[PDB]
Amino acid sequence: SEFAFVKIASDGKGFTRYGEPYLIRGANYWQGMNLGADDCSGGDRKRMELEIKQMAEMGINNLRVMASSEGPDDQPYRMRPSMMPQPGKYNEGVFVGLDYLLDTMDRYNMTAVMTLGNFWQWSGGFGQYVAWITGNQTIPYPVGDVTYDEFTQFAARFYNDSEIAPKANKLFKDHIYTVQNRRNTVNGKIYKEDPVIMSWQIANAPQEAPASWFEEISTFIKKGAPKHLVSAGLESKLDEYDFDRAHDHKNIDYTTCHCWVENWGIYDPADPDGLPHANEYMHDFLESRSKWAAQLNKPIVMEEFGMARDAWRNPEDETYKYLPSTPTSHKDEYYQKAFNQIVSLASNRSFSGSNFWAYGGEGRSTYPPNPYGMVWLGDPPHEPHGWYSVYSNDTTVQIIKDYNANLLKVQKELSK
Ligand SMILES: OC[C@H]1O[C@@H](O[C@H]2[C@H](O)[C@H](O)[C@@H](O)O[C@@H]2CO)[C@@H](O)[C@@H](O)[C@@H]1O
Numbered sequence: 001s002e003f004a005f006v007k008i009a010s011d012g013k014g015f016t017r018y019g020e021p022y023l024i025r026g027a028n029y030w031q032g033m034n035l036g037a038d039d040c041s042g043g044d045r046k047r048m049e050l051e052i053k054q055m056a057e058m059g060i061n062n063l064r065v066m067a068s069s070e071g072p073d074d075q076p077y078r079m080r081p082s083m084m085p086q087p088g089k090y091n092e093g094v095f096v097g098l099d100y101l102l103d104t105m106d107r108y109n110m111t112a113v114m115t116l117g118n119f120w121q122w123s124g125g126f127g128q129y130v131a132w133i134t135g136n137q138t139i140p141y142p143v144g145d146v147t148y149d150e151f152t153q154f155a156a157r158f159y160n161d162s163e164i165a166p167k168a169n170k171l172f173k174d175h176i177y178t179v180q181n182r183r184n185t186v187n188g189k190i191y192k193e194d195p196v197i198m199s200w201q202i203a204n205a206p207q208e209a210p211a212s213w214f215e216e217i218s219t220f221i222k223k224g225a226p227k228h229l230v231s232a233g234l235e236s237k238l239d240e241y242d243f244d245r246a247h248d249h250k251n252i253d254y255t256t257c258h259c260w261v262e263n264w265g266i267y268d269p270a271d272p273d274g275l276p277h278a279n280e281y282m283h284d285f286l287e288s289r290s291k292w293a294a295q296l297n298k299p300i301v302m303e304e305f306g307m308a309r310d311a312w313r314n315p316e317d318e319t320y321k322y323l324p325s326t327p328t329s330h331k332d333e334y335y336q337k338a339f340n341q342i343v344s345l346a347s348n349r350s351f352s353g354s355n356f357w358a359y360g361g362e363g364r365s366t367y368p369p370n371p372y373g374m375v376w377l378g379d380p381p382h383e384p385h386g387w388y389s390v391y392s393n394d395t396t397v398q399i400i401k402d403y404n405a406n407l408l409k410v411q412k413e414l415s416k
Contacts, residue, residue: 004195005227006111008253012297013349014414015254017111021414023346024301024353025059025404030066030115030123031376034079036097036104041081042372043097049104051361054392056108059404062198064113064303064355065101067179069094070124077141077382079123080372087132087171090178096185103186106196113303113355115233116176116221117203119155122380126158126203127151129168152207159206159213173220176200180224192225199229205258206233211245218251229253235304236289237264243292254352255296257289258304269308270315275330278307282338290350299352305338306357306388307331322365322386324394332396339403346410353407356400360389 006017015022035051037043055063069078071085083094105112118125127139142151158168180200182191191197200221202214214232222230234246236257247255259282261267267278286302293300309328311321320326335356345351363377365386374381378389390396 002195002227006198006229008229008299012299014299014352021411023407023411024062024355025407026062026064026301026303026353026355027055027060028304028355028358028378029055029063030358030380031378032063032065032101033067033069033083033094033098034374035376036100037093038096041091041093041097042370042374043093044376045100047362048101051359051392052104052108052110054361055359056110058397058401059408060110062111062113062353062355063105064115064201066118066123066204067098067114068117068123068175070128072137075124075139077121079381080374082124084175088174095182099182099184099186102184102194102196106187110196111198112196113199113201113231114179114197115201115204116179117172119203119205119207120380120382121151122382126155126168129172130155130157130164132171133164133167156207159209176221177224180221192227197228199231199253200225201231201233203233205235206246208242209246211249214246214252215249218249222251232256234258236292240292240295243289244296247296247298252298254299254301255293256301256303257285258357259285259302260305262308267307269311269321269330272312274312275333278334279337282334283341286338286341286345286351290345294350301352302338302342302354304355304357307334308387322384324364324366324386324391328394328396332399335396336399336403339399339406343403343406343410346407347413349414356390357388358390360386360391362392363389364391365389 003018006015006022009016035044035048069083071082073080073082073085081091081094084090102112121127131137131139140146140151140154142148157164159165180192202217218230230251230253232246232252234256236243261278261281262269266281268274289300309321309326310330314320342351342354358378360377367375369375375385379385379387
């Protein structure tokens, strides 16, 4: 009956679906729900339908999408219009967008990773929940003087403050319940009975949350939808100790890592010699995290990674860095080498696939905002438009297409 839900294999070294091994030929597409909405709510459904076609044609079987976003709608640095402008109150025009995303995905035989919250500010996230509870809407956004560490310590109260946390979490739960139980208006299916969803993911990139928190949340989610896998969203950017705190629990079915060389100060795109130090880092990152996954006997996916355009061709001009016309040779080699390393590890069942960050499609950073002020592409509005996006005609597209073909070949070999 349940032939079609993605499962863990019984040895615990990869995924199964339709009784066969299942490898992740993935991409991130967090802007999907918003592009799926009607024109009245700032959507562009004909564009969404086309962007999914482009992805199927390049060999993609899995999308990691965003399934939350918090008002109020008068805030900078976030998706607008919001999905849930106030607690328990929903924008139905935006919800319908998500219905459509999951229906298209279906017609293209793709599966979805459903992200239910955000630690960062671009969909409201944990910072907004805290604001709602303290009644103080002045979130310390990290611009000007406010540093990242200062904003981080503010949002972390969602689970580290003994008075805030219980309240915050109650409202957080209300949302999960609502989504798990949504009836798809386009095709009738209840979300929790839908084999198109691969898994429910707690949140994007929790920052040093305690183990007990992971323990209770995973259990809650699993009980809400017993047919589905359950995932954590961790970057795994620290040590093995950090890795275990998040992943070692009955109801965390598999593991994740996100890799960001520029953001962490490893790689500098304006430096023409900068590339090989980043390649080494990528290399060691994949093997160390592999061991950690093995130690717990669970599968692993690199659900996030990316790189800038060739800024070093004109280092003294900041804007040159974001033009679509600027080439991506550093980025193309960096991708290629990591794909080749993953193919070889999955040959030996020590790695399950990946999702690059992120697909831009038809969007371009030179286009004007829509009426809600959104320039829709792969880069969230806390970040310069066009930073990391892969456009429909970039040269990196061939590279992604080839990697997907190589990894399907590996999947067939392990089915013998
Ligand atoms: O930057 C691309 C994506 O990076 C991840 O999170 C970043 C975050 O934006 C912070 O700027 C930085 O300190 O590092 C974080 C994790 O390494 C993504 O999950 C998204 O936030 C970004 O679009």
